[PDB]
Short mmCIF file of C-alpha atoms in Angstrom, two decimals:
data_model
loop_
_atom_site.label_atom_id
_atom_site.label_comp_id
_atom_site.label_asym_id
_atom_site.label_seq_id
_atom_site.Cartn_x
_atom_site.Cartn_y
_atom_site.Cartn_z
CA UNK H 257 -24.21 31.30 -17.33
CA UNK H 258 -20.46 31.53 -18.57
CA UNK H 259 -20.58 34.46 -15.56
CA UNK H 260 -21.83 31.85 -13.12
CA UNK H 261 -19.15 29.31 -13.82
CA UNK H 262 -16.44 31.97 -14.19
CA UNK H 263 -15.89 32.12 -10.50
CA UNK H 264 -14.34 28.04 -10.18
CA UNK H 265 -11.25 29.32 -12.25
CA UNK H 266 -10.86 32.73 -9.82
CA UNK H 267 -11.45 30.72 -6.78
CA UNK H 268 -8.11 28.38 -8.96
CA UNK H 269 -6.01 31.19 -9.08
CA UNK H 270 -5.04 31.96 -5.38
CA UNK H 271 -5.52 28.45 -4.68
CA UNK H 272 -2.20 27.49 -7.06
CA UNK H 273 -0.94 30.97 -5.62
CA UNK H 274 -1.33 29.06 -1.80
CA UNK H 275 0.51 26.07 -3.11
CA UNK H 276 3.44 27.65 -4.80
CA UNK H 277 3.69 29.93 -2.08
CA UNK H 278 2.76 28.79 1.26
CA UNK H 279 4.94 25.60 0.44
CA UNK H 280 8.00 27.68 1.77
CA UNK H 281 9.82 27.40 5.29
CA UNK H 282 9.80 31.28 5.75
CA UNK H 283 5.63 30.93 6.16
CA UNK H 284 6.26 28.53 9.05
CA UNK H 285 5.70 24.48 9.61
CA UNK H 286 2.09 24.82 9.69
CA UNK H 287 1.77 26.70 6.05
CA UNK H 288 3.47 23.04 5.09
CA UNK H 289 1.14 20.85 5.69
CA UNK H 290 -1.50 23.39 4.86
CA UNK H 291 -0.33 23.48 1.72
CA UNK H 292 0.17 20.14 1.06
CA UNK H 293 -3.57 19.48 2.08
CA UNK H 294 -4.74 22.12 -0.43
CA UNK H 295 -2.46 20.41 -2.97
CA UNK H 296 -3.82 17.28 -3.05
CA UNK H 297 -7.55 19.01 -3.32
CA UNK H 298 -5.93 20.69 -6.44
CA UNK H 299 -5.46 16.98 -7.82
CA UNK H 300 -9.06 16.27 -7.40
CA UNK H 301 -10.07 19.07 -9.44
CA UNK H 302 -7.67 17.51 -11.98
CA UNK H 303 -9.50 14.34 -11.82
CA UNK H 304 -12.64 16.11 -12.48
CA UNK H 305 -11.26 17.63 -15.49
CA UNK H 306 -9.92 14.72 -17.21
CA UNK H 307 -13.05 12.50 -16.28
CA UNK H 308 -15.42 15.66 -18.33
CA UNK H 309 -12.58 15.44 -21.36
CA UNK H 310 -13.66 12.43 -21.83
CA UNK H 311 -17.14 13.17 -22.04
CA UNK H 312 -16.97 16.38 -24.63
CA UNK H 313 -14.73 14.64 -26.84
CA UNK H 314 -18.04 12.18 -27.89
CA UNK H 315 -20.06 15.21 -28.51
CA UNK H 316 -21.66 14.39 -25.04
CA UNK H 317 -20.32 17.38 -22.35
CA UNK H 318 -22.60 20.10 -22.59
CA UNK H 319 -23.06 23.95 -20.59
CA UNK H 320 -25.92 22.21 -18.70
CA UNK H 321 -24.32 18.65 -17.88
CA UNK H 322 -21.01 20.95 -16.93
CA UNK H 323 -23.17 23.01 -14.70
CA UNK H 324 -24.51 20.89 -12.67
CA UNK H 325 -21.35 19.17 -12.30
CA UNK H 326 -19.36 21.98 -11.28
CA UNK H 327 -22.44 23.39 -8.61
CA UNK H 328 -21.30 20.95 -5.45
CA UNK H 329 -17.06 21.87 -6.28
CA UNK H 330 -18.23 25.95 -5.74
CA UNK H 331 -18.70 24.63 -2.32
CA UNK H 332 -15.54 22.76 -2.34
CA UNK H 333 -13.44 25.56 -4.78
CA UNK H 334 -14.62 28.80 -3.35
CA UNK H 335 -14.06 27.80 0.31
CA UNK H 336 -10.36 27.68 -0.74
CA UNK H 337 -10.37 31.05 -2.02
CA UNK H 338 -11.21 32.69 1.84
CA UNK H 339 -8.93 30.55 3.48
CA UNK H 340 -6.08 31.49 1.68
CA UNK H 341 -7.00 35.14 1.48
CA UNK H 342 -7.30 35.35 5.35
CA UNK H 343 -4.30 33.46 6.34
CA UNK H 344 -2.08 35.09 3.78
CA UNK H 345 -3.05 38.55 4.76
CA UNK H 346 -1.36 40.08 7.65
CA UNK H 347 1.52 37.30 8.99
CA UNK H 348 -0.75 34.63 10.21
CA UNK H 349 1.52 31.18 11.16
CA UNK H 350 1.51 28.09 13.63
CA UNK H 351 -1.33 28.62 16.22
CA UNK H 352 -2.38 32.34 15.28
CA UNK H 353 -3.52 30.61 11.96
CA UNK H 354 -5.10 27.27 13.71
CA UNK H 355 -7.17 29.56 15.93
CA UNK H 356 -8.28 30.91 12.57
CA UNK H 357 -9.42 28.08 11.03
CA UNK H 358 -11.31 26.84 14.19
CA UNK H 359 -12.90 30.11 13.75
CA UNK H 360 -13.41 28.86 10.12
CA UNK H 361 -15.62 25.48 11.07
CA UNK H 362 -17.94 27.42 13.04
CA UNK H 363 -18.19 29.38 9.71
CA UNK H 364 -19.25 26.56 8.50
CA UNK H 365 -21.14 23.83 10.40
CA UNK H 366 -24.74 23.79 8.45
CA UNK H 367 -23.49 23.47 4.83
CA UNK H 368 -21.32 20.58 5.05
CA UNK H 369 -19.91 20.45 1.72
CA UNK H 370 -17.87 23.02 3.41
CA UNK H 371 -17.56 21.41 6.39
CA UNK H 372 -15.69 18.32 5.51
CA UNK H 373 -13.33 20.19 3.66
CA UNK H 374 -12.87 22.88 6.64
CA UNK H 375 -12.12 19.31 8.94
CA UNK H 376 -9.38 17.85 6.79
CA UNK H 377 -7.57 20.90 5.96
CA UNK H 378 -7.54 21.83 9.92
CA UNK H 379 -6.62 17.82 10.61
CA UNK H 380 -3.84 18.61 8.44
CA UNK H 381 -2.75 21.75 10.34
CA UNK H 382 -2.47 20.15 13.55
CA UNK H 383 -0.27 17.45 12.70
CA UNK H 384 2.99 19.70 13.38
CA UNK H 385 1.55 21.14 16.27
CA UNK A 153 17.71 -24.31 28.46
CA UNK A 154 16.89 -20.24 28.53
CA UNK A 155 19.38 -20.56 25.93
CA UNK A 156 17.66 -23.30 24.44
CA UNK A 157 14.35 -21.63 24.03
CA UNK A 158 15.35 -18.63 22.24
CA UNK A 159 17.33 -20.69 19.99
CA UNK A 160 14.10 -23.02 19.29
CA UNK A 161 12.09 -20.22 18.96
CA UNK A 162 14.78 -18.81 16.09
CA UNK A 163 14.85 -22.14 14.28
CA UNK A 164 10.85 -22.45 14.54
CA UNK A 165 10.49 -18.79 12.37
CA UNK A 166 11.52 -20.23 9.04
CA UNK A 167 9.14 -23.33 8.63
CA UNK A 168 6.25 -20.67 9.66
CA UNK A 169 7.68 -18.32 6.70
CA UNK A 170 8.17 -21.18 3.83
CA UNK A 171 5.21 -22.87 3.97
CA UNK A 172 3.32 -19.51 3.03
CA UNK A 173 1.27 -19.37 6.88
CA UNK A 174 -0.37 -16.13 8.38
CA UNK A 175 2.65 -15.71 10.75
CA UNK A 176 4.92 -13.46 10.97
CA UNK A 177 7.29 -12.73 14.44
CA UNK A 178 4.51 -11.20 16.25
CA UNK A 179 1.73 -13.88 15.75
CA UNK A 180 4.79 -16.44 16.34
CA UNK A 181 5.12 -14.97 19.92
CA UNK A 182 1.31 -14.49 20.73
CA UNK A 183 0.88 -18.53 19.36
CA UNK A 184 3.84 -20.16 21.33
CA UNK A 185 2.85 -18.64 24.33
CA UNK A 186 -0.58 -19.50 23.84
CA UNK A 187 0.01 -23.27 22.86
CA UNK A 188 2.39 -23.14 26.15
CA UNK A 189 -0.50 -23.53 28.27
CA UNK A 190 -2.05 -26.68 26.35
CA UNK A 191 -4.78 -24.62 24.17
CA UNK A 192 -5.77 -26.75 21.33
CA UNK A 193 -3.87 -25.62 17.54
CA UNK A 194 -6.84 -26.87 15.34
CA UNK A 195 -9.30 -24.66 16.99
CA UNK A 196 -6.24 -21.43 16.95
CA UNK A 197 -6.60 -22.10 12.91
CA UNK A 198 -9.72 -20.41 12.18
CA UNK A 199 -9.23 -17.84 14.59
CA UNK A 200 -5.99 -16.73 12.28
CA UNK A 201 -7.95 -17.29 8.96
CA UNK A 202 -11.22 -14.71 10.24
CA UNK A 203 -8.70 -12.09 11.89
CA UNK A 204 -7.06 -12.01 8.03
CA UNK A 205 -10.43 -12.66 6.49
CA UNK A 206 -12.59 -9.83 8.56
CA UNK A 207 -10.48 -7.24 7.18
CA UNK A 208 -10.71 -7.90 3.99
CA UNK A 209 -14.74 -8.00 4.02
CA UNK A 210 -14.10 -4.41 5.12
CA UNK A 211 -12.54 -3.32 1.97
CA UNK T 255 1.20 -39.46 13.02
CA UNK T 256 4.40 -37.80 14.72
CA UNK T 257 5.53 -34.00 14.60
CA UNK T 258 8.99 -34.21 12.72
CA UNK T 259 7.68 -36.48 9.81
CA UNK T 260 4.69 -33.86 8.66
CA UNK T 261 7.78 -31.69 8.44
CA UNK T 262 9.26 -34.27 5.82
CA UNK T 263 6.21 -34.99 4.11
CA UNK T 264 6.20 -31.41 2.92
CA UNK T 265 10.22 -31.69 1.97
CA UNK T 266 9.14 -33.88 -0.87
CA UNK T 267 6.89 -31.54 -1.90
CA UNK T 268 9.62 -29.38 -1.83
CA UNK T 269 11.64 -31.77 -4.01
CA UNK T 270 9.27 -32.21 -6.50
CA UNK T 271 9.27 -28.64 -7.81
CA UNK T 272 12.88 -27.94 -7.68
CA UNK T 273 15.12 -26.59 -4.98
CA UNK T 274 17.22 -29.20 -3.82
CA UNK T 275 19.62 -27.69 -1.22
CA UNK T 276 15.96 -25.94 0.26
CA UNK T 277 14.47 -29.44 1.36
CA UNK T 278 18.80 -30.25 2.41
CA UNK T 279 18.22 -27.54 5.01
CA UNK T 280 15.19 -28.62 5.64
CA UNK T 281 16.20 -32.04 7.05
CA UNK T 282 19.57 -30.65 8.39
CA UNK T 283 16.37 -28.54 10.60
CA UNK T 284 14.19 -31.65 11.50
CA UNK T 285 16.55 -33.45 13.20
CA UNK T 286 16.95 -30.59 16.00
CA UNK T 287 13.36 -30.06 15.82
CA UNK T 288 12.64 -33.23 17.37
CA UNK T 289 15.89 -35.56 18.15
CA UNK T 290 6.94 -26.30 20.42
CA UNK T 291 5.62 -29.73 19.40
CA UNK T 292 1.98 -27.83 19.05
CA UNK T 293 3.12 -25.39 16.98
CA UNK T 294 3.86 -27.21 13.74
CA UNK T 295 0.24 -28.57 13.82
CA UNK T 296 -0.98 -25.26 13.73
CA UNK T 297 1.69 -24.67 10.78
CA UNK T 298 0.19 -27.45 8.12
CA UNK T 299 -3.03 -25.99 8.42
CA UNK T 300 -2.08 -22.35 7.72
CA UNK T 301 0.45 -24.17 4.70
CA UNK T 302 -0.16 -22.40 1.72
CA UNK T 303 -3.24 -19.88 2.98
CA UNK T 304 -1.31 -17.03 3.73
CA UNK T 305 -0.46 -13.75 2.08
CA UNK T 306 1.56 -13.86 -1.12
CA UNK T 307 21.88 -13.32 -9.15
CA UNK T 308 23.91 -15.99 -7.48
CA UNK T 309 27.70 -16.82 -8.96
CA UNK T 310 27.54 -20.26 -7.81
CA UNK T 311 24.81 -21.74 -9.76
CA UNK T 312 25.99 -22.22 -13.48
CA UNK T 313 28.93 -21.20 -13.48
CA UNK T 314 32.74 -23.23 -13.22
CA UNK T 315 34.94 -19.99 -13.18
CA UNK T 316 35.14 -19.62 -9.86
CA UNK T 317 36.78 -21.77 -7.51
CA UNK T 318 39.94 -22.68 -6.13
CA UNK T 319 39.30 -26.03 -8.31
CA UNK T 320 36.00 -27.05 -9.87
CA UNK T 321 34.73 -30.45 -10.28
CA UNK T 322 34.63 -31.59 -14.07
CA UNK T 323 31.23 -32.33 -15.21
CA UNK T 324 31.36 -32.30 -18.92
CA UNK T 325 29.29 -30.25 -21.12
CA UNK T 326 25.69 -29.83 -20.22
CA UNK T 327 24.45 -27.32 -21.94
CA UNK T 328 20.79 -27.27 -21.40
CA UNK T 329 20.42 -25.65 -17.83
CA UNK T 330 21.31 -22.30 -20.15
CA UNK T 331 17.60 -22.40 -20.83
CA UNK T 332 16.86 -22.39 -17.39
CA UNK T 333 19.34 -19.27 -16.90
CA UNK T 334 16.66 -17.53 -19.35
CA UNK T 335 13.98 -18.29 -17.12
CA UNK T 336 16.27 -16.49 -14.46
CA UNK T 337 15.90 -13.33 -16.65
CA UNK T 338 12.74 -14.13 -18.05
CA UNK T 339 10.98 -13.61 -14.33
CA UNK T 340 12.21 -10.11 -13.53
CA UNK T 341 11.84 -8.80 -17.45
CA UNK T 342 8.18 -10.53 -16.58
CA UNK T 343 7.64 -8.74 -13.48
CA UNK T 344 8.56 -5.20 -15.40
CA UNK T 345 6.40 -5.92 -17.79
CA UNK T 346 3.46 -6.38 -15.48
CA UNK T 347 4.44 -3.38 -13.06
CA UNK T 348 3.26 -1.62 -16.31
CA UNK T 349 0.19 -3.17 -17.25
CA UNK T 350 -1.10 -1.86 -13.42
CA UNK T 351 0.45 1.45 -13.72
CA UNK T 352 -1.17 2.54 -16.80
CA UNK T 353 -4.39 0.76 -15.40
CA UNK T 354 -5.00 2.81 -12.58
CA UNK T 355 -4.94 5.96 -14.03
CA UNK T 356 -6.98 5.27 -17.56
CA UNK T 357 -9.35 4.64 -14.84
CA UNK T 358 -9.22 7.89 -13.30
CA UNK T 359 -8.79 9.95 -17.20
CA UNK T 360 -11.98 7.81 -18.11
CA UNK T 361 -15.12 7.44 -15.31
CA UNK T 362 -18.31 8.14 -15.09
CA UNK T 363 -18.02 12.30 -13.40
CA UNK T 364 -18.97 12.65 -9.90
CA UNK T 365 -16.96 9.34 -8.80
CA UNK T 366 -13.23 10.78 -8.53
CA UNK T 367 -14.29 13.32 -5.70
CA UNK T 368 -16.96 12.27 -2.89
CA UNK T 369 -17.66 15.72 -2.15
CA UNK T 370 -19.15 16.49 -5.36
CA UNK T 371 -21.41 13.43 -3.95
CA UNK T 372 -23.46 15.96 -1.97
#
C-alpha cells in the first residue's frame, strides 16, 4: 500500500524541479506562465497537507482515510509528472510546446480529473502568446 | 454654458460621493444623461440597488 | 419640497456628528447648485446604501500669528482617538489575516482542492 502511495511524492519531485527551473527567461515566456500555473497547483497540494495534519494529530488520519484521499490528486499529481518530462526534454518553448499540450487534452478528454487540469495549465500558456 | 455644464457636472460628483450612494463617475454619466430626457429618478433607484444587489446573490 | 433644501437638511446631519468646515462647504456648494435638478432626488434615496495627519487642527505653532484661545486642554483626548483609529484598523487587519488561513490549516479534507471533488 505504502508502494501505491509512493508514486504522489515522485510525481512531487520533477514537479518542484519544473518550478525552480522552468521559472527562468532562458526557457522562454511561455515556460513563465507555465510555471507559474504549476506553482500555484503545488500550493494546493500544500493545502491538502496541512488540512490531513490536522486530522492525524487527534489520532484520527489513518493509511485507509489517507488513501482514499490521495486516489483523485494521482489524477491531478501524476499528470504533472508527463508534462514536465515532455516539455523539458529536447528544447520545447513558445508554440512548439503549446502544440504539445493541445496534443496533451486529446490525451485526455474521457478522464476529466485530467482534463480540467490539462485546460488551465494550457489557458495559462496562451496568455503570452 | 458648455462651460457651464462640465463645471455642474464637476460640482455634482461630490454630493453623489459623501452621502455614501452607488455612484461613482461612470454611473454619474449614464444617470445625467438619462434624467436629461425627463425619465423619472424614483423608479432609476431600484434599478441601481438590483444591478449592486444581483451580484452579490451570485457570490 | 425644493431641490437645494434636501441638500441642507442632510448638512445638519452633517453637523450633528462633527465636521464643521464639511457642512461650510457644503452650503458654500448649495448656493451654486440652485441660485441636474433630477439628479439629487435620485441622490437621497441611494444616501447611505452604498458600498463602504493634518498640522492645522490642534496645533498653535504654526502661523504667521495665531489667535489666542486660552488653554483647552481636552480636545488632546480627541487627538488619541486620531491614533486610536489607525492602531484600531492594524489591529483588525490581523484578526482577518490569521483568519483566513487557520481556515485553510484546519477543514474538513477534500474542500481546499475541487478536483479531489471527483
Amino acid at each position: 500500500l505504502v508502494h501505491r502511495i509512493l508514486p504522489v511524492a515522485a510525481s512531487y519531485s520533477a514537479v518542484t524541479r519544473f518550478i525552480e527551473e522552468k521559472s527562468s527567461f532562458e526557457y522562454g515566456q511561455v515556460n513563465h506562465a507555465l510555471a507559474a500555473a504549476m506553482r500555484t497547483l503545488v500550493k494546493e497540494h500544500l493545502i491538502l497537507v496541512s488540512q490531513l495534519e490536522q486530522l492525524h494529530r487527534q489520532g484520527l488520519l489513518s493509511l485507509q482515510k489517507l488513501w482514499f484521499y490521495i486516489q483523485p490528486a494521482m489524477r491531478t499529481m501524476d499528470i504533472l509528472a508527463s508534462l514536465a518530462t515532455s516539455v523539458d526534454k529536447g528544447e520545447c518553448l513558445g508554440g512548439s510546446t503549446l502544440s504539445l499540450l493541445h496534443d496533451r487534452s486529446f490525451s485526455y478528454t474521457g478522464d476529466s480529473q485530467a482534463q480540467e487540469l490539462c485546460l488551465y495549465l494550457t489557458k495559462a500558456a496562451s496568455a503570452p502568446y | 454654458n458648455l462651460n457651464a455644464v462640465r463645471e455642474t457636472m464637476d460640482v455634482l460628483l461630490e454630493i453623489s460621493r459623501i452621502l455614501n450612494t452607488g455612484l461613482d463617475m461612470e454611473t454619474l454619466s449614464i444617470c445625467v444623461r438619462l434624467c436629461e430626457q425627463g425619465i423619472n429618478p424614483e423608479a432609476l433607484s431600484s434599478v441601481i440597488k438590483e444591478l449592486r444587489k444581483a451580484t452579490e446573490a451570485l457570490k | 419640497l425644493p431641490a437645494r433644501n434636501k441638500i441642507l437638511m442632510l448638512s445638519f446631519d452633517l453637523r450633528v456628528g462633527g465636521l464643521g468646515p464639511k457642512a461650510d462647504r457644503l452650503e458654500e456648494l448649495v448656493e451654486e447648485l440652485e441660485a441636474v435638478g433630477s439628479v439629487l432626488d435620485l441622490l437621497v434615496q441611494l444616501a447611505g446604501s452604498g458600498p463602504p495627519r493634518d498640522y492645522f487642527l490642534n496645533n498653535k505653532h504654526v502661523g504667521r500669528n495665531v489667535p489666542y484661545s486660552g488653554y483647552d486642554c481636552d480636545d488632546l483626548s480627541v487627538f488619541e482617538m486620531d491614533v486610536q483609529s489607525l492602531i484600531s484598523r492594524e489591529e483588525c487587519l490581523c484578526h482577518s489575516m490569521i483568519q483566513e488561513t487557520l481556515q485553510v490549516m484546519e477543514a474538513a479534507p477534500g474542500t481546499g482542492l475541487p478536483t479531489v471533488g471527483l
